[PDB]
Coordinates of C-alpha atoms and ligand atoms in Angstrom, one line a residue:
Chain F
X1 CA -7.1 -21.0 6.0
X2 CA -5.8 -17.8 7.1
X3 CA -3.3 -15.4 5.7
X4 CA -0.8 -15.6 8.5
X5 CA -0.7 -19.0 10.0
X6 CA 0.8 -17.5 12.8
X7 CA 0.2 -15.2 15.6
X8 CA 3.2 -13.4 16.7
X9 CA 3.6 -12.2 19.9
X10 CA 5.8 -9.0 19.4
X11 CA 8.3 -10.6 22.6
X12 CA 8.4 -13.9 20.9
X13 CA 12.6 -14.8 20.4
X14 CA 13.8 -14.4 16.9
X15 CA 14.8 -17.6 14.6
X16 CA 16.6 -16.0 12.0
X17 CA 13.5 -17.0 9.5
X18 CA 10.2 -15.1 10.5
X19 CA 11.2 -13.9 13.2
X20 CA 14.7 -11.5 12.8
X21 CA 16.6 -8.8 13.1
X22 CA 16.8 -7.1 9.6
X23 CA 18.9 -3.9 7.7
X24 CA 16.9 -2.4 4.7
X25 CA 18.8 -1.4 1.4
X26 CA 18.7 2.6 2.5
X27 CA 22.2 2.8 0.6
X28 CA 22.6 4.7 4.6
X29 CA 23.7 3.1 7.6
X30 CA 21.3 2.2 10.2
X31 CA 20.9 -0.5 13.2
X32 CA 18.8 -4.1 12.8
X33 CA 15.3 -3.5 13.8
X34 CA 13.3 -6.7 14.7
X35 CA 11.0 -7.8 11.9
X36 CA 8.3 -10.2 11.2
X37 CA 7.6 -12.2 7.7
X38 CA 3.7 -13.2 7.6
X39 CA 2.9 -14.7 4.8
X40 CA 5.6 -15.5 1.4
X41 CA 6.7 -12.4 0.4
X42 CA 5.4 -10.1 3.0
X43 CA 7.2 -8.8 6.6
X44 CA 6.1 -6.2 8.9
X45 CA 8.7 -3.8 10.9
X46 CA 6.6 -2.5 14.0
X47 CA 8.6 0.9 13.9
X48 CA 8.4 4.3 13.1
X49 CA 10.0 4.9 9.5
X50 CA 13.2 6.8 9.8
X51 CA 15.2 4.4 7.6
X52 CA 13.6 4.9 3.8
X53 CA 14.3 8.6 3.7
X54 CA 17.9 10.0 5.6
X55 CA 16.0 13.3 5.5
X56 CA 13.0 12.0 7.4
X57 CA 14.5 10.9 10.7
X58 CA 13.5 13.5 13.1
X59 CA 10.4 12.4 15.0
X60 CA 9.9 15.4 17.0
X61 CA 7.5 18.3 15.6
X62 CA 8.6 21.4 14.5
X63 CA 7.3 24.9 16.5
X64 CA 3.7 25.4 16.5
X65 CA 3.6 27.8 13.9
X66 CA 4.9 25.4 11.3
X67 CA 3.1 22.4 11.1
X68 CA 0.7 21.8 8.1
X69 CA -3.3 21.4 8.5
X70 CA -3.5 18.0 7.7
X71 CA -1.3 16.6 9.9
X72 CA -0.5 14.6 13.6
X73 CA 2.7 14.7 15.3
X74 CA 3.4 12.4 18.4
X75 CA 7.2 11.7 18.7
X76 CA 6.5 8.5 21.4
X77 CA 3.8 6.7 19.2
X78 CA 4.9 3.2 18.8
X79 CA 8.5 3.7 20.7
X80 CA 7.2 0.9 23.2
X81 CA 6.8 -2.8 23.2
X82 CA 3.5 -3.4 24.1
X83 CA 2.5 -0.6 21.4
X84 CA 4.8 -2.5 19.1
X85 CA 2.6 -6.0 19.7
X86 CA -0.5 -4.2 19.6
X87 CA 0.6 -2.8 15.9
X88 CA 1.8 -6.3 15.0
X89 CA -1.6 -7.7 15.7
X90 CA -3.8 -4.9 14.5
X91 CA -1.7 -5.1 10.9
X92 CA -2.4 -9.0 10.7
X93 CA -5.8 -8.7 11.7
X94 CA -6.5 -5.9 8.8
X95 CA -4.5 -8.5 6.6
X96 CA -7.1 -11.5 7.6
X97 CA -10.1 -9.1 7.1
X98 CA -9.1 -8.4 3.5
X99 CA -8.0 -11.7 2.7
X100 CA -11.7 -12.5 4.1
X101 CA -12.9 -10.8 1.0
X102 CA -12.5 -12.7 -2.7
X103 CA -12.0 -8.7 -3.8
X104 CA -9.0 -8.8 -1.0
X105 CA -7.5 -12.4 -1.7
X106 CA -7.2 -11.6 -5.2
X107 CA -5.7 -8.3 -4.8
X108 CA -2.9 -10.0 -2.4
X109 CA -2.4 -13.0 -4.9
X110 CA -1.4 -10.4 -7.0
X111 CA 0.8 -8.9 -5.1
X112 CA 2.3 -12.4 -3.4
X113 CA 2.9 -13.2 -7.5
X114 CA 4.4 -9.1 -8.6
X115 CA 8.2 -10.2 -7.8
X116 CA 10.2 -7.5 -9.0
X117 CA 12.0 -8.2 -12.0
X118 CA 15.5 -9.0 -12.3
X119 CA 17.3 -6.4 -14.2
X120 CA 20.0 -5.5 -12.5
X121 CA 22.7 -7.2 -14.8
X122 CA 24.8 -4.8 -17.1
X123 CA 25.0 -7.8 -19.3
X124 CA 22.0 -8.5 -21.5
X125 CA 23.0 -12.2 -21.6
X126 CA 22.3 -13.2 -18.1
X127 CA 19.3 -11.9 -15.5
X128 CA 20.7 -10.4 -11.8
X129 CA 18.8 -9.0 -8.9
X130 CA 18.7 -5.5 -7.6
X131 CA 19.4 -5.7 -4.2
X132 CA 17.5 -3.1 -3.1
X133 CA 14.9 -5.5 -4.6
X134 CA 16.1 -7.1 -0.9
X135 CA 16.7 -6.6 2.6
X136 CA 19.5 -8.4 4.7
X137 CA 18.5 -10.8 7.3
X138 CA 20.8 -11.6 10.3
X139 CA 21.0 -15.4 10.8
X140 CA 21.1 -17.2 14.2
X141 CA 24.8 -17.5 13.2
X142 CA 25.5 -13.3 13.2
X143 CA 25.8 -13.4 9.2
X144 CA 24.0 -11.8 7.0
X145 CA 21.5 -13.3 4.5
X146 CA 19.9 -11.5 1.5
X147 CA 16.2 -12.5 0.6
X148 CA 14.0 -11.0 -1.9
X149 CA 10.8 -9.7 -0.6
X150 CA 7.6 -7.6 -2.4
X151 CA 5.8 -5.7 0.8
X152 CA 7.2 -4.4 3.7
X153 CA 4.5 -3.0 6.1
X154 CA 5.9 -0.1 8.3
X155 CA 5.1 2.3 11.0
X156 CA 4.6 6.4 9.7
X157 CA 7.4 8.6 10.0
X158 CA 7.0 11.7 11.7
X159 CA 3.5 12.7 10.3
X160 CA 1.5 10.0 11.7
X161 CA -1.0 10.3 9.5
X162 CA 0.8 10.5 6.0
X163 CA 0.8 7.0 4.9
X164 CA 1.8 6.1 1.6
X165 CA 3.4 3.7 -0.6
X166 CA 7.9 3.9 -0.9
X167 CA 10.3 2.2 -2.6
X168 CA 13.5 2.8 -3.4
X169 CA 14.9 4.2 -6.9
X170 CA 17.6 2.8 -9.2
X171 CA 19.6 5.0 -10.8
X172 CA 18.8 4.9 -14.3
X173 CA 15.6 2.8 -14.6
X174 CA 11.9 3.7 -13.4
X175 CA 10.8 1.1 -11.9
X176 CA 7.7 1.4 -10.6
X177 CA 6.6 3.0 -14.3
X178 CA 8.9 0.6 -16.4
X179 CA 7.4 -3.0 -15.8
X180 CA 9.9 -3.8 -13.9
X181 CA 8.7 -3.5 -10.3
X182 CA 10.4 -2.9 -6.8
X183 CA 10.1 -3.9 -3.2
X184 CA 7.1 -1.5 -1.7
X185 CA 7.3 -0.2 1.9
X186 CA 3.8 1.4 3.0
X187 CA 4.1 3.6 6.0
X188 CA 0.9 2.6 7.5
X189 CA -0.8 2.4 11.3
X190 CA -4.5 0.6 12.4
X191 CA -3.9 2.3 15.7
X192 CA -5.6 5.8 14.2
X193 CA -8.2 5.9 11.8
X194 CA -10.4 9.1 10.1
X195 CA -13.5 11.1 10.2
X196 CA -16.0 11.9 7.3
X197 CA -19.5 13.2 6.6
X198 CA -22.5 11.1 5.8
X199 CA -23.6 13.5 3.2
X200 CA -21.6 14.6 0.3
X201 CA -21.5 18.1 0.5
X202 CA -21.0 18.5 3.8
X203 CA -17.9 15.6 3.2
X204 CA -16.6 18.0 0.2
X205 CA -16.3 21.5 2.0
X206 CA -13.7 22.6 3.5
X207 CA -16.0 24.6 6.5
X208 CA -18.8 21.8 7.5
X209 CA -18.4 18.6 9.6
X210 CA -16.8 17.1 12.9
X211 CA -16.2 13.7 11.2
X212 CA -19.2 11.9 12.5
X213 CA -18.4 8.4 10.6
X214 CA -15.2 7.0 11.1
X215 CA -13.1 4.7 8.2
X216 CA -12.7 1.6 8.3
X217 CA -8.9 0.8 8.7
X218 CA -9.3 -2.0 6.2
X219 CA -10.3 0.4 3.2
X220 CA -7.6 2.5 4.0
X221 CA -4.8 -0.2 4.7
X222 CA -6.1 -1.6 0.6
X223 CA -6.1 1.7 -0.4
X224 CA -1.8 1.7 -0.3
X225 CA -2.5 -2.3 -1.2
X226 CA -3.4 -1.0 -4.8
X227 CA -0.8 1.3 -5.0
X228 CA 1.6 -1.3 -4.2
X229 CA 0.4 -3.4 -6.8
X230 CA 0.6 -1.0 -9.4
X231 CA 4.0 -0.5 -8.0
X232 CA 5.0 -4.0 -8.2
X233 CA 3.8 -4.6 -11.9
X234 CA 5.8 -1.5 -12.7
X235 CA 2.8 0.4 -14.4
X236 CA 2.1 3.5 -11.9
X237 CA 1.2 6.4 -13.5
X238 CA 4.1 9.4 -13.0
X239 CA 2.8 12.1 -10.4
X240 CA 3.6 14.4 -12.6
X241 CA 0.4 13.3 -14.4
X242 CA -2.3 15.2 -12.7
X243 CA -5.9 16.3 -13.4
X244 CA -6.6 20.3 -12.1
X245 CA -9.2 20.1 -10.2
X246 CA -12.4 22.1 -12.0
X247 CA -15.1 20.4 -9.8
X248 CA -15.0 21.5 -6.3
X249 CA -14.5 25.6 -5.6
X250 CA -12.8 24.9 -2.9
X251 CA -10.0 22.5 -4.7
X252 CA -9.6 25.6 -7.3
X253 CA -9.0 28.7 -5.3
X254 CA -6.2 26.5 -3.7
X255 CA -5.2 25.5 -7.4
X256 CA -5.0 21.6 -5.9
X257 CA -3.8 19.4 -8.7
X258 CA -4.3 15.6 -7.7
X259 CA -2.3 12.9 -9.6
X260 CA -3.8 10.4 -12.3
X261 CA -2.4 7.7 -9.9
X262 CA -4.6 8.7 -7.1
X263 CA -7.7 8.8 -9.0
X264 CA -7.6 5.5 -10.6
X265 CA -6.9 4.1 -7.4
X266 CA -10.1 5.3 -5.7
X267 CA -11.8 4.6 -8.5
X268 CA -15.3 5.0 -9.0
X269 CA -16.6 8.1 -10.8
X270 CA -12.6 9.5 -9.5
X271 CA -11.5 7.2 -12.1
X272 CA -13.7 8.7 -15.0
X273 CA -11.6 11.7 -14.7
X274 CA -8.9 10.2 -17.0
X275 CA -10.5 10.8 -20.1
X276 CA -10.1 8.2 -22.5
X277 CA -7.1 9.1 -25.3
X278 CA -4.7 9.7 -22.1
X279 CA -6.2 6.2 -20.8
X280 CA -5.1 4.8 -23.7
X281 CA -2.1 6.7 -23.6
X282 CA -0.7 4.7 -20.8
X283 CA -1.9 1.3 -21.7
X284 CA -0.1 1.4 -24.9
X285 CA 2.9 2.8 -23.0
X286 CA 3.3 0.1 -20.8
X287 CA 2.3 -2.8 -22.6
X288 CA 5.7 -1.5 -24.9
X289 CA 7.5 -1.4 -21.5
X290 CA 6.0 -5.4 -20.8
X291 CA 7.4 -6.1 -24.7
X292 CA 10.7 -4.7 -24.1
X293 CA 11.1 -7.4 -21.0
X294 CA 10.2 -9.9 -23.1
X295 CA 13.1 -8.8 -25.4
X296 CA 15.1 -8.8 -22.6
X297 CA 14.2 -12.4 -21.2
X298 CA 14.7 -13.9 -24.8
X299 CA 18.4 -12.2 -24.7
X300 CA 19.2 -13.8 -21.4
X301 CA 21.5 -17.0 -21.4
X302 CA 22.7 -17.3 -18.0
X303 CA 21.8 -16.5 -14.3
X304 CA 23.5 -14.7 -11.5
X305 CA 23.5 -16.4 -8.1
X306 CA 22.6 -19.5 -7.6
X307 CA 19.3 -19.4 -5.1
X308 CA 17.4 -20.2 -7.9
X309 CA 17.3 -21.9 -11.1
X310 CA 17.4 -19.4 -15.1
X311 CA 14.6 -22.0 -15.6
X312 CA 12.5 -21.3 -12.6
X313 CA 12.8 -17.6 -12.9
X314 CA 12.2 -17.3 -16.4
X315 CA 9.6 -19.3 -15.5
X316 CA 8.6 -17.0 -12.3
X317 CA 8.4 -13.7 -14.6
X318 CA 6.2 -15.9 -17.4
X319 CA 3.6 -16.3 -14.4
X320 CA 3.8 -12.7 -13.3
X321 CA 3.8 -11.0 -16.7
X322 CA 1.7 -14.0 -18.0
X323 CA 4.0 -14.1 -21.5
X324 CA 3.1 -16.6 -24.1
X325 CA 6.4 -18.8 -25.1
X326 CA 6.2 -20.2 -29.1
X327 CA 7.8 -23.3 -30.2
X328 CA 11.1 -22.1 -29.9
X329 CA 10.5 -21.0 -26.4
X330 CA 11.1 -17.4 -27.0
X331 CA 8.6 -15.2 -25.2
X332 CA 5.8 -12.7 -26.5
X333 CA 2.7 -10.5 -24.8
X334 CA -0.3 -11.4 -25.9
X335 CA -2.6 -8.2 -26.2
X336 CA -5.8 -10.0 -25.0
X337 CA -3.8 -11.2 -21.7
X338 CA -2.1 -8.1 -21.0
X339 CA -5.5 -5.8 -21.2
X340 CA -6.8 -8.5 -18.8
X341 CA -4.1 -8.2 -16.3
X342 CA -3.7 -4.4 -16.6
X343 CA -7.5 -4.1 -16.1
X344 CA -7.3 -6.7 -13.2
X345 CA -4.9 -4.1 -11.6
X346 CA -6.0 -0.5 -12.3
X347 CA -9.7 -1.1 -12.2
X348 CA -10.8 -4.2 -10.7
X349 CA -8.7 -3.5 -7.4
X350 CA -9.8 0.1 -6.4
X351 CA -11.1 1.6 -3.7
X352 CA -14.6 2.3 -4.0
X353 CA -14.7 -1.6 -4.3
X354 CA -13.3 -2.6 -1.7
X355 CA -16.2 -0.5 0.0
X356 CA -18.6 -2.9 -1.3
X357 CA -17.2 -6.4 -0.1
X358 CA -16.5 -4.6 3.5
X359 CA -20.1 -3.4 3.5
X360 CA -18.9 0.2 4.8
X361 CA -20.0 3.4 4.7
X362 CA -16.8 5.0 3.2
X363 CA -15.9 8.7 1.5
X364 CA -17.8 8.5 -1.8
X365 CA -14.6 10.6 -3.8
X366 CA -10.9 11.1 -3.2
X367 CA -11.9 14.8 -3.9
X368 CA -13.1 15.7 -0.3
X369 CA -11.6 17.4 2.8
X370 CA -10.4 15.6 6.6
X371 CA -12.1 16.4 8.9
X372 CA -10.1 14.6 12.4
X373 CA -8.2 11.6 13.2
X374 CA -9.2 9.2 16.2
X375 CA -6.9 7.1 18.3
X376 CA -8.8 3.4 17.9
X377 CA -7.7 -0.2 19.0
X378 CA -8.8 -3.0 16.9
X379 CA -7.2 -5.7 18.2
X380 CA -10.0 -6.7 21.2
X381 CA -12.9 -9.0 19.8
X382 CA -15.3 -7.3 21.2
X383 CA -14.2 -3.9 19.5
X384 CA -13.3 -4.9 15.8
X385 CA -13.3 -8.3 14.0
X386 CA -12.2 -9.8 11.2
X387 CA -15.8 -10.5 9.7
X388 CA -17.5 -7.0 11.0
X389 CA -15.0 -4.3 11.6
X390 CA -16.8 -2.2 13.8
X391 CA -20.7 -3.3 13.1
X392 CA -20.6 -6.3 15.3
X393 CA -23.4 -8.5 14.3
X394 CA -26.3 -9.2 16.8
X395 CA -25.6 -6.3 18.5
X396 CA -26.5 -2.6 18.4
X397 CA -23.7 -1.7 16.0
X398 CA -24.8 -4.5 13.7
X399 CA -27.1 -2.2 11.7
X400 CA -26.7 1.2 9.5
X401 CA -23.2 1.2 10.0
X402 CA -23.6 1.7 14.0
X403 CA -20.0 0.6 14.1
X404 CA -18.6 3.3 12.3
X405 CA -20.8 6.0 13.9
X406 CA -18.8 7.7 16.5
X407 CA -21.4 9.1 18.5
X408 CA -23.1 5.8 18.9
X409 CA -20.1 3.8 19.4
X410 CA -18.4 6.6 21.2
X411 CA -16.3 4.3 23.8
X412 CA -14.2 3.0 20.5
X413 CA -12.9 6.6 19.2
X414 CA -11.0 9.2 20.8
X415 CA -10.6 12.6 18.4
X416 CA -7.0 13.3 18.6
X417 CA -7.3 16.6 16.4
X418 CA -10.2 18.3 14.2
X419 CA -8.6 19.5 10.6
X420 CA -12.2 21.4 9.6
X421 CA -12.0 25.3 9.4
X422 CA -8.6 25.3 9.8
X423 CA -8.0 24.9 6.0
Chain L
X1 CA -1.3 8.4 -0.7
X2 CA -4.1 7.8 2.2
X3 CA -5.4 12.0 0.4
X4 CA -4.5 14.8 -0.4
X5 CA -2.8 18.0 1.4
X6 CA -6.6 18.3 2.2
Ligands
ZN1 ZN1 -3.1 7.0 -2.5

């Protein structure tokens, strides 16, 4: 069965359910924008994201002379409905290609399970929301609805290529580094994708390389996936937690610091970075910040609302936490359980992985330089698929990544902008 | 983060 038992048509009227208009919690105002729910849990807003940040509503690119290397600007991307139906399609298809994967349908069972917790209550005798845990759903009736979601997939804002993984703050608790967890927008597009180098030191210098190989959308879309489930189980690692790069010249004589949280989520050798007392560091920290919910829980009487039952969500965050209950029914972590799930999410899930159930050729560190962005379109069958990508089997693009290499299968990428030398 | 300001 597929992830999305539906296929959306971006035209198709809305129903008030899966198909609405919706307001996020920006604590700002803003109009509805039509949205789409996918799968439990999950809805996609075809639109550029001007609503998360007040500050970061301006589309249009500054002069020429003040735009950063790394970066695309295109004020009319995704302003029209066709684009908006190709971007609804091209998300769910990157959805069913990880889902494809047992790598991919683990990481999102994960996710689908990661509720964020209900802390909101003043009163440590009964468990509330936090609304911004929410976004408001207009009904066929005009009203408003509030539903609880985990993952909201949305268009970039004005850098098209800056995707990454928001959510909003609360404003005393941390949490996305508290156990507690919070609704995760990822600015994210599968209409654009990104060169590398076949060989590692040509991928790693600043100077060499037109981006010959281009990246699977896939890897990139799990790539904010991970982040989201850190995010979610409320154990991300601050930013202000970085390693100073010492192993690439280039990274140095810029004085680039990358954060913990980055590293882990690539993965691989990235990951080995973290040496092992500051690995330990955190893994004590949070499993304290999964005990104190516990403590928490066991202190809750009543329940706020009435969507759902105390007993079903203490129930729910037993599940997501996986907390042992004694005979009393008061609930504990169990150190063996929570090393297993904490694993689960920092290591298992990680990029590099995800390379090797896609079978792709992929940047081999997180420690490299861009080297130009493409304008793709995934959503024909004969272009991308669900099983393949781009390395169609029984054809020429089946073997050594044929797919991916923009030279061979030239008619698939269009170079937008080249970032190399301009460093 | 899809990288860094590189
Ligand atoms: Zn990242």
């Amino acid at each position: 069965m597929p992830f999305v038992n539906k296929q959306f048509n971006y035209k198709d009227p809305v129903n008030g359910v899966d198909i609405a208009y919706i307001k996020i919690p920006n604590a700002g105002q803003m109009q509805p924008v039509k949205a789409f729910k996918i799968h439990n849990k999950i809805w996609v807003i075809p639109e550029r994201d001007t609503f998360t940040n007040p500050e970061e509503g301006d589309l249009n690119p500054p002069p020429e002379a003040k735009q950063v290397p790394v970066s695309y600007y295109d004020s009319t991307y995704l302003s029209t409905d066709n684009e908006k139906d190709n971007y609804l399609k091209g998300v769910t298809k990157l959805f069913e290609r990880i889902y494809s994967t047992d790598l991919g349908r683990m990481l999102l069972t994960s996710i689908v399970r990661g509720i964020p917790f209900w802390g909101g209550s003043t009163i440590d005798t009964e468990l509330k929301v936090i609304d911004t845990n929410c976004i408001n759903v207009i009904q066929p009736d005009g009203s408003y609805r509030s539903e609880e979601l985990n993952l909201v997939i949305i268009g970039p804002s004005a850098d098209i290529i800056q995707f990454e993984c928001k959510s909003f703050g609360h404003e005393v608790l941390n949490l996305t580094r508290n156990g507690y967890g919070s609704t995760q927008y990822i600015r994210f597009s599968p209409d654009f994708t990104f060169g590398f180098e076949e060989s590692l030191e040509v991928d790693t210098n600043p100077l060499l390389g037109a981006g010959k190989f281009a990246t699977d959308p896939a890897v990139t879309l799990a790539h904010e996936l991970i982040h989201a489930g850190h995010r979610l189980y409320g154990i991300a690692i601050n930013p202000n937690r970085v390693f100073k790069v010492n192993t690439n010249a280039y990274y140095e004589m810029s004085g680039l610091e990358v954060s913990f949280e980055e590293l882990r989520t690539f993965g691989g050798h990235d990951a080995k970075f973290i040496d092992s007392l500051q690995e330990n560091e955190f893994r004590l920290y949070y499993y304290n910040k999964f005990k104190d919910i516990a403590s928490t829980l066991n202190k809750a009487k009543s329940i706020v609302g009435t969507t759902a039952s105390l007993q079903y969500m203490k129930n729910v965050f037993k599940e997501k936490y996986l907390l042992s209950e004694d005979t009393s029914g008061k609930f504990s972590v169990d150190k063996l359980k929570f090393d297993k799930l904490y694993k689960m999410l920092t290591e298992i899930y990680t990029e590099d992985n995800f390379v090797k159930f896609f079978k792709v050729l992929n940047r081999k560190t997180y420690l490299n330089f861009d080297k130009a962005v493409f304008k793709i379109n995934i959503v024909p069958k004969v272009n991308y698929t669900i099983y393949d990508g781009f390395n169609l089997r029984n054809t020429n693009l089946a073997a050594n990544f044929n797919g991916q290499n923009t030279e061979i299968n030239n008619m698939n990428f269009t170079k937008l902008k080249n970032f190399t030398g301009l460093f | 983060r899809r990288a860094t300001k590189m």
